[model samples]
Target: GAMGETGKIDIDKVEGRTPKSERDKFRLLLELIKEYEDDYGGRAPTNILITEMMDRYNVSEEKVEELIRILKDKGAIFEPARGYLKIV
Candidate 1:
């Protein structure tokens, strides 16, 4: 498991306000996955597709993907599948 003290979310750079859409989207993704722990209970669902994310968050496919990529680079997310993402 690649779990350890990583880094912070850099809230200052976070777009919009504290409860902004992007922030809510990130929280929603984490909460939804946690709710489905039985299906992906091990460590976590380390691989989630953009289409799936978009559908769940009611966001555009492009926006979902972009956000995921940003999160990954920000050390808040990771990719287990080629074009997928998961909280890190």
Candidate 2:
């Protein structure tokens, strides 16, 4: 399963076996955020953006959260304030 019993991703299994669609979505999400920051002065309305991302991708809130977590872990994004995201 993509999600484990604890509702967390299995990083070990996912490292080499990520699906193409999931990878594409992650790439697109990052690109969109970068574009948004470039156009909006480097700050994104996290809540609305996350909601729209979930809706646009037809993914769960948890999935979007997971993506955010991954980005943070990778040093690609950071939380400058509560409920706000910034690209680094």
Candidate 3:
């Protein structure tokens, strides 16, 4: 798999006061998005991405929503429209 030490997310690069678990989730989300970017034209639907994150990370929908809010507040991602998100 492409996910190894080299592909691990740098917690320091993530802004805000995210806990370790949330950081891990964010990392996983980023990695997944990167993996699918070319196929999705660099923009993934919010619901699809969130569903994948929940499945892959064993997180609840509420948790994913909370993380999305934090990630957006931290400038890690942005929703250009109602249901689309792109890394910043």
Candidate 4:
């Protein structure tokens, strides 16, 4: 991902032999966050729970949460507050 105005997220797009299921899940999760940010004025309510979003997306809570963890681990998302998230 990018930092400030100097970097870009898609500076290099990597594609390789990966399972479709895994890729699909990854892309869906990524787009979900982006969409959420775009629709929620860049910062989802810190108090806004993700459970609703999970249901709205028709994705399991565990799966969605796990995907969030993955995003954090990949340095794509950041913990702005104890229960809040932001893209980096």
lDDT for residue 17 in candidate 2, whole number 0-100: 56
CA deviation > 4 Å runs, candidate 3? 1-23
TM-score of each: 0.48, 0.63, 0.66, 0.54
Q: Rate the local accuracy (lDDT) of all candidates.
A: 0.59, 0.72, 0.75, 0.64
Identify the candidate with maximal TM-score: 3
Question: Model 3, 6-61: lDDT tens per residue?
Answer: 55565766677665644587777666666666778887677877899878888788
- Report clashes for each candidate as comma-separated counts: 0, 0, 0, 0
Candidates in descending lDDT order: 3, 2, 4, 1
Worst ten in a row by lDDT for model 2: 13-22
Model 4: which ten-residue window has the lowest total lDDT?
A: 44-53
Q: What are the per-residue Cα lDDT tens digits for candidate 2 across 1-88?
A: 5854665554665556555644566775676577677677887667756787877777677877787888878989877879777886
Runs of candidate 1 exceeding 4 Å displacement: 1-23, 32-38, 41-49
Off by over 4 Å in 2: 1-23
Best candidate according to lDDT: 3
